[PDB]
Design a protein around this ligand. Structure first.
Ligand SMILES: c1nc(N2CCC[C@@H]2C2CCC2)c2cc[nH]c2n1
Length: 167
């Protein structure tokens, strides 16, 4: 038994809810929150801008030190950093950006990083501000992640479409 509430169960391991990943993290304080990162960990908008704002910019300060030491992530890659006031850890995952000409098959590579963590609260990768078809992103998630993932989709219209179209 865990602390996540109000989720619809899609599969043995994938759960979904119409929620802001930020308010959900503040309420639950999960072990892992996933950020929809870019390779530079520049948290300017969307999930990353909203998560970073909720940390009072401490996520950006930590991220700039990470990049100064390690250089950029790979598209499809990830790193584990602090979850600050939101979670124990933040898993920064880089889904492809189709607005940059970046392989949609890197989205499966992005969701494979979730399998190193038994449970995660996560957003739909490569959606919203980043561009991909969220219905596709949910299918890849279900067919790739084997650990327990709680998806917070911040669009009720899109949430209802994802649920009503889910195979
Ligand atoms: C969850 N998803 C978030 N987005 C923003 C862009 C893409 C993603 C969803 C919007 C439908 C998919 C946000 C943003 C702030 N909080 C969020 N929580």
């Amino acid at each position: 038994v865990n602390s996540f509430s109000g989720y619809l169960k899609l599969t043995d391991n994938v759960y979904i809810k119409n929620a802001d990943i930020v308010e959900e993290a503040k309420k639950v304080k999960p072990t892992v929150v996933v950020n929809a990162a870019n390779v530079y960990l520049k948290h300017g908008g969307g999930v990353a801008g909203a998560l970073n704002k909720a940390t009072n910019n401490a996520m950006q300060v930590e991220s700039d030190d990470y990049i100064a030491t390690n250089g950029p992530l790979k598209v499809g890659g990830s790193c584990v950093l602090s979850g600050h006031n939101l979670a124990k850890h933040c898993l920064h995952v880089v889904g492809p950006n189709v607005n940059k000409g970046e392989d949609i098959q890197l989205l499966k590579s992005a969701y494979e990083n979730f399998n190193q963590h038994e449970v995660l609260l996560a957003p739909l990768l490569s959606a919203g501000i980043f561009g991909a078809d969220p219905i596709h992103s949910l299918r890849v998630c279900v067919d790739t992640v084997r650990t327990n993932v709680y998806l917070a989709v911040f669009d009720k219209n899109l949430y209802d479409k994802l649920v009503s179209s889910f195979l």
